[PDB]
Every structure is written in C-alpha cells, then in structure tokens.
Amino acid sequence: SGFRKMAFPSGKVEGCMVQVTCGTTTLNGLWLDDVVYCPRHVICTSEDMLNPNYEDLLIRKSNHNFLVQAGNVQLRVIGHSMQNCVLKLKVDTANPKTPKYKFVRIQPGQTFSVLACYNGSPSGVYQCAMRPNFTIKGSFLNGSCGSVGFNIDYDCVSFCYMHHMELPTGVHAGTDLEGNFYGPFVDRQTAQAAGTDTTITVNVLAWLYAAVINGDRWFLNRFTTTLNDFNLVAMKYNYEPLTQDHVDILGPLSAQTGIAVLDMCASLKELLQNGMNGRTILGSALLEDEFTPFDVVRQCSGVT
Ligand SMILES: *CCC(=O)N(c1cc(C(C)(C)C)[nH]n1)[C@@H](C(=O)Nc1c(C)cccc1CC)c1cccnc1
Numbered sequence: 388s389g390f391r392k393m394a395f396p397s398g399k400v401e402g403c404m405v406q407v408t409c410g411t412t413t414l415n416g417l418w419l420d421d422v423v424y425c426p427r428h429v430i431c432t433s434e435d436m437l438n439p440n441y442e443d444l445l446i447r448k449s450n451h452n453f454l455v456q457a458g459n460v461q462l463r464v465i466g467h468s469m470q471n472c473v474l475k476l477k478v479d480t481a482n483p484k485t486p487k488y489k490f491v492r493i494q495p496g497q498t499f500s501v502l503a504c505y506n507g508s509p510s511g512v513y514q515c516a517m518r519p520n521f522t523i524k525g526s527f528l529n530g531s532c533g534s535v536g537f538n539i540d541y542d543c544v545s546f547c548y549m550h551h552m553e554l555p556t557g558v559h560a561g562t563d564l565e566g567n568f569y570g571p572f573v574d575r576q577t578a579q580a581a582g583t584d585t586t587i588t589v590n591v592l593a594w595l596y597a598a599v600i601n602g603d604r605w606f607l608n609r610f611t612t613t614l615n616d617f618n619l620v621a622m623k624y625n626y627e628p629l630t631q632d633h634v635d636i637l638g639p640l641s642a643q644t645g646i647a648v649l650d651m652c653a654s655l656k657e658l659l660q661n662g663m664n665g666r667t668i669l670g671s672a673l674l675e676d677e678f679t680p681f682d683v684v685r686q687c688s689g690v691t
Pocket residue numbers: 414428431436527528529530531532533551552553554555574575576577
C-alpha cells in the first residue's frame with residue numbers, strides 16, 4: 388500500500404558517468420562501450436555562449452585537448468565527432484560497467500528518472516515528466532550538463548535525455564542521445580520561449596486510478612460523460628485532449644478497479660469545474676500529471 392514518486396534504481400547509470408574537460412569548461416559525460424557522449428557546448432568559453440559557431444570552434448580542438456576522467460582513471464581520446472548537439476569522443480578503453488542499453492527519443496507526457504551529477508559524480512535521483520511543451524521542471528545547478536534521463540526495462544537501460552541548459556524562466560531543456568533537442572531550443576545563450584504548457588490528462592486519470600486502488604474514493608460521483616463533452620471542458624482548463632489510444636492504455640486500470648474510463652472522466656470534469664475544496668488525493672491538494680498509466684501499474688503490481 389501507499390504511493391510515491393519513485394525513481395528507477397540508478398546503479399547501472401552510475402557506472403557510466405564521467406567528467407569531461409575541454410579548456411576550463413567541465414561537465415558530465417556518458418561512457419558506453421568506447422565512446423563518451425556529452426553536450427557539445429563543452430568546447431565553448433563564456434565569450435562564445437551568446438553566438439557560438441560550433442563548426443569553427445570544433446576545428447580548433449584536437450583529440451588531446453579533451454580530458455575524460457572516470458573516478459581516478461584518465462581515458463585517452465583517440466577520435467572525436469559532433470552529431471547535432473552532442474559530441475562523441477572515441478576512447479581507447481571500453482567501459483567494463485557498460486549496461487544493456489538503447490537510445491530512445493520519448494514523447495511528451497512520458498516519465499523518466501534523472502541522475503543529477505557534478506564533475507561526473509552522482510548527487511541524486513528523481514522522476515519527472517517531459518512537459519507537452521518539451522521542457523522539464525528539473526533540479527539542476529551549474530555543471531549538471533550531461534546528466535541523463537533513463538528508464539529501465541528489466542536489465543535494459545533506455546537513455547532518453549541529456550541535460551543541456553536552463554531557460555531564463557528556470558525550466559530545463561536537453562537532447563536525445565543523438566543530439567536532437569526536444570522542443571524548439573538551440574544551445575545558445577539567447578532568450579528562448581517554451582510554448583504554453585498543458586496538463587497531461589491521461590496521466591491525471593492514471594493517478595485517480597492509483598488513488599481508488601489505495602483507498603481514496605471521495606471524488607467518485609454518479610455522473611458519466613461523452614469523450615467529446617469531456618474534451619470541451621479539458622480545453623478551457625489547458626488540459627491535453629483525450630484520444631481513443633488514451634482510453635485503450637487505461638483499460639487495465641479500468642478492469643482492475645471496475646470503473647469505466649468515461650466514469651473516471653466525469654469525476655475529473657467535476658474536479659476541474661469545482662476544484663478540490665480543501666480535500667486531498669494521495670495527500671496532494673492538486674491534480675498530479677507526472678505518473679503514466681505504465682507507472683501506476685508497475686508501482687501497484689511490484690515490477691522489478
Ligand atoms: C553545463 C552548463 C551549465 O551549467 N549551464 C550552461 C548552458 C550554457 C549554454 C547552453 C548557453 C552554452 N551555458 N551554460 C547553465 C545554464 O544553462 N545557464 C543559464 C541559466 C541558469 C539561465 C539562463 C541562461 C543560461 C545560459 C545562457 C545551467 C544548466 C542547467 C542548470 N543550471 C544552470
């Protein structure tokens with residue numbers, strides 16, 4: 388019983404974090420097989436950050452201008468390529484701790500665990516969602532760049548996120564592990580705007596299911612509704628509209644609790660149009676959208 392924001396155990400990622408140093412810029416990198424992946428802005432000085440020419444900047448650097456360190460081990464860089472916004476350094480040594488891993492680009496509304504690091508050392512682990520506007524509400528200080536987001540599927544580590552920067556608004560932007568930004572952001576110290584953020588409706592519904600399961604049923608009502616009718620109310624409140632795929636994904640939670648998705652949608656509507664009124668759900672006074680239906684099931688079934 389009980390319900391928490393749970394992160395994946397970080398063990399397998401801890402063994403891939405390294406410190407990367409070019410000139411006087413240091414940040415984190417990710418050491419898999421005989422390659423170190425890190426944000427390409429490692430090769431910028433402070434002057435350069437307003438309007439960097441990454442091609443002209445990279446042409447000045449050699450293999451020996453890069454210092455990769457794993458704990459007290461120095462690694463020797465023997466190749467270097469730029470792939471979009473990441474830098475690949477080819478090292479002499481394959482990482483004995485390299486896990487079963489994939490690189491995955493994720494979709495907005497998906498959750499993952501971040502291992503936040505400084506100088507290639509772990510400081511803490513937390514779970515978060517990729518916002519619909521392609522930012523994350525993270526916790527990152529200077530030097531956290533190259534911290535990664537990851538999911539685990541049994542013994543397989545799926546890398547989905549590398550942290551590149553904080554926006555002037557205080558939220559976080561980064562790339563997949565092929566160096567493509569999530570969202571419309573560039574790795575440039577200039578003013579950039581995220582879109583309007585929305586609430587991830589499917590995840591709110593999954594959290595309501597988690598609540599019922601764990602005893603918390605006050606908000607259940609007699610009413611029901613249409614998908615169309617429900618989406619009209621969701622839009623006025625900046626909620627993501629609900630598709631049939633979203634209904635299909637909640638089927639298991641529906642079956643386990645014996646509550647129709649649309650009956651749960653009717654319960655949600657009523658909370659949008661009346662708020663919580665000084666009540667709580669799983670000890671939150673707000674609607675929580677950082678658990679997917681997958682997360683609720685893993686946590687409420689005991690998946691290792
Ligand atoms: C790892 C580097 C680092 O800590 N930061 C960073 C990113 C960059 C760019 C992408 C511009 C080359 N330069 N330095 C900072 C960061 O992004 N700083 C920042 C902030 C906090 C607010 C507005 C603009 C900028 C950069 C112009 C960083 C990254 C994550 C978390 N805290 C700070």
